Amino acid sequence: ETLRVDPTNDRLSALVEIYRMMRPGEPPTREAAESLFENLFFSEDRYDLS
Amino acid sequence: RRRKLPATIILRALNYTTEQILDLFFEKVIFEIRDNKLQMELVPERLRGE
Amino acid sequence: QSQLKLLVTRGKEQGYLTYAEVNDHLPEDIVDSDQIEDIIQMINDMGIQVMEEAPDA
């Protein structure tokens, strides 16, 4: 059902949608849409469970 | 803590195709079409409460 | 359709005025400081008819 209500279909649209959800303003690109998602749960300088 | 999104969008954001996503939560059921009919990989334990 | 039906059917009347609910069930770019006052104005005060003044606006 979750997939049934999912607009995105690949990785680009996913990262872009997340980018527009987090930072609603500037047009989502490639580097920004990726680096933003990486600096959320996949970077020591931006995420740490200690 | 922002607006809600389908929890499969992060999976796609982790480079997961829809087929791969389906093969990560659910158990698959294979059907065969042989001798002009429909067969099924029956699992007795799965028939509980049906 | 979407916004109207969801807002009306849900808020009946959401009891404690559950604000942190339907604001996510809205489109466009979120986290604004503009759309806020347009929801805290309709829910209470002029009840019943105000919920009919909301959609038309």
**Which residues fall within 8 angstroms of residue A2, CB to CB, at 6 or more apart?**
B6, B7, B8
CA–CA min distance A12, chain B (Å) = 8
Peptide bond into C13 cis (omega under 30): yes
Look at chain C and report how many structural domains it folds into.
Answer: 1
Name which of C50, C41, C51, C7 is nearest C27 in CA terms: C7
Q: Does B1 touch chain C (CB under 8 A)?
A: no
Query: Which residues precede a break in chain C, with C-to-N distance above 2.5 Å?
Result: none
Are the C-beta atoms of B14 and B21 separated by less than 8 Å?
Answer: no
Query: Tokens 């099924």 sit at which residue?
Result: B40
Residue with tokens 């791969």: B20
Q: What share of chain A is helix, strand, coil (3-state, %, to 5)?
A: 45, 0, 55
Residues of C in contact with A20 (CB under 8 A): 29
Experimental method: X-ray
Q: Please list every residue in chain A whose beta carbon sits closer than 8 Å to the beta carbon of residue B26.
A: none
Residue C30's closest CA among A38, A17, B10? Answer: A17
- For residues C29 and A20, the answer to whether their CB atoms sit within 8 Å is yes
Which residue of A10, A20, A38, A40 to mutate against B (max B Cβ within 10 Å)?
A10
Range of the domain at C45: 1-57
**Tell me, what CATH number does C56's domain have?**
1.10.220.120
- Within 8 A by CB and 6+ apart from B29, the residues are B40, B41
